[PDB]
Amino acid sequence: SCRLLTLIIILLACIYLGYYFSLSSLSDEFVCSIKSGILRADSTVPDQFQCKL
Amino acid sequence: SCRLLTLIIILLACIYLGYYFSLSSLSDEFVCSIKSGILRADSTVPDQFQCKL
Ligand SMILES: CC(C)CCC[C@@H](C)[C@H]1CC[C@H]2[C@@H]3CC=C4C[C@@H](O)CC[C@]4(C)[C@H]3CC[C@]12C
Ligand SMILES: CC(C)CCC[C@@H](C)[C@H]1CC[C@H]2[C@@H]3CC=C4C[C@@H](O)CC[C@]4(C)[C@H]3CC[C@]12C
Numbered sequence: 724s725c726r727l728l729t730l731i732i733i734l735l736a737c738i739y740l741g742y743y744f745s746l747s748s749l750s751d752e753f754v755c756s757i758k759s760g761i762l763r764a765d766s767t768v769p770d771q772f773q774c775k776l
Numbered sequence: 777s778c779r780l781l782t783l784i785i786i787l788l789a790c791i792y793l794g795y796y797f798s799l800s801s802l803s804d805e806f807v808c809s810i811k812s813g814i815l816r817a818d819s820t821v822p823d824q825f826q827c828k829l
């Protein structure tokens with residue numbers, strides 16, 4: 724039972740890592756917008772920012 | 777008739793000038809707001825300006 728759980732967890736980890744490595748490699752670039760709350764009416768703040776992880 | 781019209785116009789002018797001289801002398805200070813049109817959404821513009829004639 725311990726061996727089977729180790730195998731199951733290793734297979735789940737393999738699935739997750741294979742999925743993660745398959746990500747677009749441009750998925751680390753996302754557009755972000757600080758315009759909630761009182762900054763919504765703020766015009767000195769651009770509509771959106773180019774962030775990169 | 778010309779003399780009477782001159783007298784009438786002079787009296788009307790006296791009334792107007794007496795009114796004008798009686799103005800508050802602070803009536804030359806007025807608050808003005810450039811917030812029509814697309815500047816309404818503009819936050820870099822204060823709500824109102826202190827103008828003086
Ligand atoms: C233990 C061994 C079999 C692991 C091998 C890696 C496997 C699990 C990886 C490698 C490539 C991966 C796939 C790559 C792309 C996609 C498309 C996506 O829209 C859904 C997930 C899916 C379908 C992934 C599922 C997991 C996957 C099949
Ligand atoms: C540790 C275990 C739970 C890992 C299991 C794999 C995880 C990491 C991944 C592999 C493929 C992934 C799925 C791929 C595609 C989609 C379709 C999308 O519209 C909603 C998310 C969903 C349904 C993903 C959910 C998470 C997912 C199941």
Ligand SMILES: CC(C)CCC[C@@H](C)[C@H]1CC[C@H]2[C@@H]3CC=C4C[C@@H](O)CC[C@]4(C)[C@H]3CC[C@]12C
Nearest residue numbers: 786787788789790791792793794795796798799
């Ligand atoms: C030819 C002679 C009689 C001219 C004398 C000046 C007269 C016409 C001026 C001097 C003071 C003036 C008044 C000063 C203040 C006010 C109050 C305002 O709420 C209405 C106008 C009114 C009532 C003005 C009317 C004109 C007025 C009476």
Ligand SMILES: CC(C)CCC[C@@H](C)[C@H]1CC[C@H]2[C@@H]3CC=C4C[C@@H](O)CC[C@]4(C)[C@H]3CC[C@]12C
Nearest residue numbers: 784785786787788789790791792793794795796
């Ligand atoms: C050349 C002629 C027409 C000059 C006549 C006098 C003019 C300059 C002035 C003298 C007093 C003034 C009035 C004084 C007070 C008021 C009340 C206000 O709620 C509306 C304007 C009104 C009704 C003004 C209209 C203009 C007026 C009549």
